[PDB]
Write a protein that binds this ligand. Structure first.
Ligand SMILES: Nc1ncnc2c1ncn2[C@@H]1O[C@H](COP(=O)(O)OP(=O)(O)OP(=O)(O)O)[C@@H](O)[C@H]1O
Ligand SMILES: [Mg+2]
Lengths: 294, 97, 232, 244, 53, 48, 242, 105, 98
């Protein structure tokens, strides 16, 4: 800009009111809104570096509110007010969203309290997509699991499937895969297997070839078995269980290959007589695995 | 285009972006612990990436003469002015369409 | 290239005017003149040229006024304009303020005169450099004039043909002539020495030397001929 | 490139006037001129190179005064900067007759920018090739501008031009960092000297002479004057001490 | 090569500063290659000699 | 955008519906490391 | 091949190449301006790009007070910006004492535009590279925006934009007026019309603005003032808050 | 150097850009004595005198002071070079033949 | 003659009819979105040629994959048009000969 007095002063201020952290917390028992406004005045600054530092203090203060079962309402309000103002670049609030999620887990609040807090978090972040994404998809997963126990499981299929078409971010390949398999599972329950198919074609099958995703490969194929089974295509179901068989976990462990080999065989016979069925049935005979089963 | 769909311009490094080139090569070399370099590099002009990796190299000919095992702010800033000076006698910088 | 001469109104890519530098050249090709001073006198000594030995030399000191005077080096038509301009100002000072013109204010008026030709399309920056001396109320001064129009005060300088030899003399003997004050002969003698050295393939003649002097109790006086023959 | 110089009003296809850019390049070859604006004043310092050791010392200035309160220092060609200040004295003088007060610094900024602009607008004159830093003190406090040969000006907290603009803009950039407050004019006298001393490592072939001037509301009665004597020596000692 | 003989820098009269600069450029990254390995700079790929003929 | 994304997987550019593009021009005033850029992408991807 | 080394000499298409290279000099400071009409105000909001920290920001401007009821926003270069501003001021003065009343937005813009034509008519001056947009609320026309171009072409407007990223500004504006079906903004105080101009500019460019990075001039009924950075700041959190 | 390409001359390729000026007054002096260590040398000669009087002499011209002195010495029919022969060695090259061409001085 | 009789010119100035047609036919072979307006890129610049219409769309899906999106928005379309918009002075948007 042209003035360097605001950069210095706020870096000073954040350090100073973190040694006064005990004095403020005690005054919070006396007037929680008196204490909180001290910290707000800091985040009216126009220097983003110093805004990251004062939000650390906000995070400390807001635990007490969450922990009380009627002060968490003022948490909802506060989130809303901090985000809309400027977002203090796009840096400050991102750190806040990440640390709010871990505090929700440790408080152990009522299921109602846990949902309403997450629902207001996603409202804020709707149209933003800058680096919110990385956090947002983790945020929404807390609704889905609460909603499984509810009769609202179908509604959970709707929210989570739409979300990942807008959200990707920079998350790891293992996380991305895990959401999309969860969604396929919620679309079996919704009764749209065809919808599930479209989500399966998003992740490449080439992405499975490494062993960090080795478990994910197993669940994925097994979901594709359920999906073509439902439409009653036994040629497709026959081919999928063969993918599972060649995977290293199944093949080497003595126990795990057994139910798999039995299922390939039952389904291959149920397949329409193709040129495909021919080549594959006589592959089954070549194997010495088969001879243990009788 | 249609062979050549993007036409990417690499331009001169900007005033913030010359010091970002500078910072990596001073990882590489030995130094007395400098940080007032960032401003000197920034308002000094007539440079390009190549000449920035020469400003470390020209700073180690002063290290050689004085007999120093590090690049001081005496060695360094004397070097930035020397590279700068020669660029502004010749090497006008070519025209770019 | 050199297509950025041909106009005195176009800056070159390098930010020079070639035309003003080419004016600096014209000086070297004409005669040499030396300035030097003390604090009681300023003295000019100038090499005069002839064209043939029926020709009787050419005057290169013009009396400006009785407490001012100048020498020329370079083109002679360019010289005439400036020595005339300079005199207008000295007469003006006498008529309007009854006051001797100050060398420093003179020089900045001369500067102006030059920058008038430099901005304008048409015309040339003047092809002559002048070494200006005077003695005013603040004692002796010596300025060096250029085509660019820069006036610079100096204890001693030289411009013109092979002037490095005189500037070399001057450097070595800078302090010796500064400290001498009250003896007009010694500054006269010292300038003689400098201009001898400037020469290459020539010797001093009684009609080469021209001596010009101004002081505390010395009117402007132009010596030539048998008046520079006490101090040959 | 080639073409659209050789004229000083001809637009380029890029959208520029070439010859006007070549002006700035001449200003770069000129000696270093800086101004540091201060909280109750302005300080102008300039690096005056020594042609030879036969020069009279402290008798040749690139500092000139305008009216009785406005400082000007130019970098670029020495006589061009002179010519532009003379025009300025007449303009400040016409303002002064007309209204019976000294000029505002914003007033002068407008007027000067029209005279530089006039020579970029016509085909029979070469545009100027000097920057001129100027400013002073008025009713409305202290102010500092730097006028480019393009005829561009803005206020500055601190301004530098010439061969040493590379060093000088950087030192001034530290100066704002260390003092956003303003810095007194006295302490800026001692500062002015250090800035030049480090800017003289871009003109190291020759020797220099340091001349400082100032204009301060409370330590010069609003008037511009040369800094000399004890103030000038202290600044020398300051610059000498820290350079070694 | 034709085995060019040496004629040493001392028989190149005057111009002491230029010879020292040119020696920095060519001679000493070879010799004090101990110093390019310590310092960890890159080698210069040439030195231009320009001037009036 | 042009080089490394259709190189890794051209399958997502078919969904988009444009032809996979090829060709990059690097142009700039010299010493800016246009060659260095070629040696940096030669290092990292590790193709032919 | 002849025909931008001269002001007056035409090309064989009947174009003046040199005059058009002035329409292309308005990118040299690289700022954008937007001025829109409300229903009791005319707003102009243009960037203030203060590049360096050696500059004091409060002397950086493009909005010039021309007269009691007249502002002007400049896009393009500073040297010509100042020449445009003095002539319009000089003429504002002339009109009032000669013809004894205030100067409307038309009268000034037409006179400058004719003046630009004269400067292109001779080969003894050049065109300037600056685009001028005059802003006022007129005495019997109300809100008025007249854009005066470097050739001397002028057309009035509901909304106009100028600068490098002008095209991005232009689609956003078009869609607004199309959908609304009025040639105005129906917000009935200038404090929200200003907010509306900020709003569209953030979306177009994709950039946040801050106190130093905007300049706002406001023509109100029968008076004119250019807003400080702290008043602009009030406006900027009004946007953020709904 | 003014016709060399700007992609030629720039770091990465040519890193050092070393200028050779016309030789200074002392430097000129030094060159004289270095050619004179291969031929007759008299103690009449003073090489610091000759250096000053050569003004705008490059080093090859200074080989043409010392060569041309031996040309003067042979034309005499001397089997010795004198200090004078060197002064007349200076008059051989100067880029002039002892002139200026003027219609004003 | 005997060899060439037809000297069929191929222009680069073109007209508003044929810019419009080349755009809709390229935008019938790839995705679109409802916000993506193609008939507002033939008026802003006016000396565009057929190869550059094949640049503009390709580059439209390069903004679209930067976001990671399956359709081409008006934000994508505009950014990619500003790359390789061409600098030509044979354009009409900067004119006054009307
Ligand atoms: N962006 C950069 N980061 C760090 N080093 C760089 C950078 N740019 C250039 N360099 C340095 O400069 C060197 C020379 O650059 P390079 O020759 O590759 O350039 P170029 O722009 O293709 O020019 P030309 O092909 O005309 O020589 C590199 O080997 C590296 O040391
Ligand atoms: Mg290369």
């Amino acid at each position: 800009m042209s003035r360097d007095a605001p950069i210095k002063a706020d870096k000073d201020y954040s350090q100073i009111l973190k040694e006064e952290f005990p004095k403020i917390d005690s005054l919070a028992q006396n007037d929680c809104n008196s204490a909180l406004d001290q910290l707000l005045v800091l985040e009216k600054k126009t220097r983003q570096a110093s805004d990251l530092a004062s939000s650390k203090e906000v995070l400390a203060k807001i635990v007490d509110l969450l922990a009380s079962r009627n002060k968490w309402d003022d948490l909802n309000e506060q989130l809303t007010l901090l985000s809309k103002k400027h977002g203090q670049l796009k840096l400050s609030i991102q750190y806040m969203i990440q640390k709010v999620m871990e505090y929700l887990k440790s408080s152990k609040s009522l299921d109602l309290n846990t949902r309403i807090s997450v629902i207001e978090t996603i409202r804020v972040v709707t149209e933003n997509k800058i680096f919110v994404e990385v956090e947002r998809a983790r945020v929404t997963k807390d609704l889905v699991e609460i909603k499984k126990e509810e009769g609202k499981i179908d509604e959970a299929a709707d929210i989570l499937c739409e979300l990942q078409v807008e959200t990707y971010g920079s998350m790891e390949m293992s996380e991305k895969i895990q959401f999309i398999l969860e969604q396929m599972e919620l679309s079996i329950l919704k009764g749209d297997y065809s919808q599930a198919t479209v989500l399966s074609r998003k992740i490449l099958k080439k992405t499975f070839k490494n062993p960090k995703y080795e478990s994910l490969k197993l669940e994925y194929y097994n979901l594709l078995v359920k999906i073509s089974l439902h439409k009653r295509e036994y040629l497709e179901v026959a081919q999928y269980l063969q993918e599972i068989y060649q995977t290293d976990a199944i093949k080497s462990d003595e126990a795990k290959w057994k139910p798999v080999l039995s299922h390939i065989v039952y389904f291959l016979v149920l397949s329409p007589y193709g040129n495909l069925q021919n080549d594959l049935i006589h592959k089954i005979q070549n194997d010495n695995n088969l001879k243990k089963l009788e | 285009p249609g062979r050549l769909d993007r036409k990417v311009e690499i331009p001169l490094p900007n005033e913030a972006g010359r010091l970002e080139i500078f910072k990596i090569h001073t990882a590489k070399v030995k130094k007395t612990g400098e940080f007032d370099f960032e401003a000197a590099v920034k308002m000094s002009d007539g440079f390009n990436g190549a000449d920035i990796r020469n400003c470390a190299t020209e700073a180690g000919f002063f290290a050689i003469r004085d007999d120093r095992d590090h690049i001081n702010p005496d060695d360094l800033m004397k070097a930035v002015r020397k590279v700068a000076e020669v660029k502004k006698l010749e090497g006008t910088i070519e025209y770019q369409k | 290239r050199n297509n950025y001469d041909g106009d005195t109104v176009t800056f070159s890519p390098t930010g020079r005017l070639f035309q003003v530098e080419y004016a600096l050249e014209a000086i070297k090709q004409g005669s040499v003149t030396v300035g030097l001073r003390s604090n009681t006198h300023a003295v000019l000594v100038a090499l005069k040229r002839n064209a043939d030995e029926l020709s009787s030399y050419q005057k290169k000191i013009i009396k400006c006024d009785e407490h001012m005077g100048l020498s020329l080096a370079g083109l002679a038509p360019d010289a005439r304009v400036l020595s005339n301009y300079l005199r207008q100002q000295c007469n003006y000072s006498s008529l309007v303020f009854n006051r001797k013109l100050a060398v420093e204010r003179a020089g900045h008026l001369l500067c102006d005169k030059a920058q008038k030709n430099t901005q304008s399309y048409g015309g040339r920056p003047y092809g002559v450099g002048l070494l200006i001396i005077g003695y005013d109320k603040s004692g002796a001064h010596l300025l060096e004039f250029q085509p660019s129009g820069n006036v610079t005060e100096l204890y001693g300088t030289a411009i013109g043909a092979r002037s490095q030899g005189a500037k070399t003399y001057l450097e070595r003997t800078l302090d010796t002539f500064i400290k001498i004050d009250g003896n007009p002969d010694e500054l006269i003698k010292a300038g003689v020495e400098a201009i001898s050295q400037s020469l290459r393939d020539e010797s001093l003649t009684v009609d080469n030397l021209s001596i010009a002097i101004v002081g505390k109790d010395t009117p402007f006086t132009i010596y030539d001929g048998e008046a520079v023959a006490k101090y040959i | 490139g080639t073409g659209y110089d050789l004229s000083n009003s001809v637009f380029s296809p890029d959208g520029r006037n070439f010859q006007v850019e070549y002006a700035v390049k001449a200003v770069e070859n000129g000696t270093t001129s800086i101004g540091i604006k201060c909280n109750d004043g302005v300080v102008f310092a300039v690096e005056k190179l020594i042609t030879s050791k036969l020069l009279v010392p402290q008798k040749n200035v690139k500092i000139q005064v305008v009216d009785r309160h406005i400082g000007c220092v130019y970098s670029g060609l020495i006589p061009d900067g002179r010519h532009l200040v003379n025009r300025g004295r007449e303009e400040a003088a016409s303002f002064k007759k007309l209204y019976k007060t000294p000029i505002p610094i914003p007033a002068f900024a407008d007027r000067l920018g029209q005279y530089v602009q006039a020579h970029t607008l016509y085909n029979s004159v070469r545009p100027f090739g000097v920057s001129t830093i100027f400013g002073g003190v008025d009713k409305n406090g202290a102010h500092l501008y730097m006028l480019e040969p393009s005829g561009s000006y803005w206020g500055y907290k601190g301004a530098a031009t010439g061969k040493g603009r590379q060093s000088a803009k950087a030192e001034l950039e530290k100066l704002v960092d260390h003092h956003p407050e303003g810095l007194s004019a006295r302490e800026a006298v001692k500062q002015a000297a250090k800035i030049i001393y480090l800017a003289h490592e871009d003109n190291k072939e020759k020797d220099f002479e340091l001349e400082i001037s100032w204009c301060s509301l409370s330590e010069t009665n609003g008037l511009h004057k040369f800094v000399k004597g004890d103030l000038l020596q202290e600044a020398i000692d300051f610059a000498q001490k820290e350079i070694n | 090569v034709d085995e060019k003989p040496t004629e040493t820098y001392s028989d190149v009269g005057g111009l002491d500063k230029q010879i020292e600069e040119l020696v920095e450029a060519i001679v000493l990254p070879m010799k004090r290659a101990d110093k390019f390995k310590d310092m960890g700079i890159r080698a210069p790929k040439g030195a231009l000699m320009y001037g009036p003929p | 955008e042009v080089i490394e994304l259709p190189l890794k997987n051209p399958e997502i550019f078919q969904r988009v519906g444009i032809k996979p593009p090829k060709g990059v021009l690097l142009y700039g005033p010299p010493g800016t490391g246009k060659t260095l850029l070629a040696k940096a992408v030669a290092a990292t991807i590790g193709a032919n | 091949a002849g025909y931008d080394r001269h002001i007056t000499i035409f090309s064989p298409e009947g174009r003046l190449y040199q005059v058009e290279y002035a329409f292309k000099a308005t990118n040299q400071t690289n700022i954008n301006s937007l001025a829109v009409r409300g229903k009791d105000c005319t707003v102009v909001i243009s960037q203030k790009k203060v590049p360096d920290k050696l500059l004091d920001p409060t002397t950086v401007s493009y909005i010039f007070c021309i007269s009691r009821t007249i502002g002007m926003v400049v896009n393009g270069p500073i040297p010509d910006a100042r020449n445009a501003a003095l002539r319009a001021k000089a003429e504002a003065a002339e009109f009032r004492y000669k013809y004894g009343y205030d100067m409307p937005c038309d009268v000034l813009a037409k006179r400058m535009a004719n003046l630009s034509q004269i400067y292109t008519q001779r080969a003894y001056m050049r065109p300037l590279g600056v685009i001028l947009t005059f802003v006022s609320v007129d005495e019997e026309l109300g809100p008025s925006i007249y854009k005066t171009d470097p050739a001397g072409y002028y057309v009035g407007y509901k909304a106009t934009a100028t600068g490098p990223k002008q095209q991005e500004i232009t689609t956003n504006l078009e869609n607004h007026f199309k959908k609304s079906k009025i040639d105005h903004i129906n917000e009935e105080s200038w404090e929200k019309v200003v907010e509306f101009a900020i709003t569209h500019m953030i979306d177009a460019l994709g950039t946040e603005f801050s106190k130093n990075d905007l300049e706002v001039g406001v023509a109100t009924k029968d008076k004119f003032f250019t807003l400080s950075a702290e008043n602009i700041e009030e406006r900027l959190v009004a946007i953020a808050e709904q | 150097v003014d016709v060399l390409d700007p992609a030629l001359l720039r770091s990465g390729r040519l890193d050092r850009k070393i200028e050779f000026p016309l030789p200074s007054e002392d430097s000129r002096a030094q060159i004289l004595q270095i050619h004179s260590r291969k031929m007759t040398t008299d103690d009449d000669i003073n090489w610091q005198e000759l250096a000053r009087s050569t003004d705008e002499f490059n080093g090859a011209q200074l080989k043409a002071v010392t060569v041309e002195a031996g040309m003067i010495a042979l034309r005499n029919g001397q089997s010795s070079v004198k200090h004078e022969d060197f002064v007349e060695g200076i008059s051989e090259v100067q880029a002039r033949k002892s002139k200026s061409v003027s219609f004003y001085a | 003659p005997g060899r060439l009789d037809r000297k069929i010119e191929f222009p680069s100035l073109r007209d508003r009819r044929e810019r419009r047609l080349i755009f809709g036919t390229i935008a019938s072979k790839m995705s679109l979105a409802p916000e993506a307006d193609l008939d507002s890129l033939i008026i802003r610049n006016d000396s565009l040629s057929g190869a550059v219409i094949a640049a503009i769309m390709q580059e439209a899906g390069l903004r679209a994959v930067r976001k990671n999106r399956y359709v081409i928005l008006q934000s994508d379309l505009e950014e990619a048009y500003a790359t390789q918009v061409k600098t030509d002075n044979t354009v009409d948007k900067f004119d006054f000969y009307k």
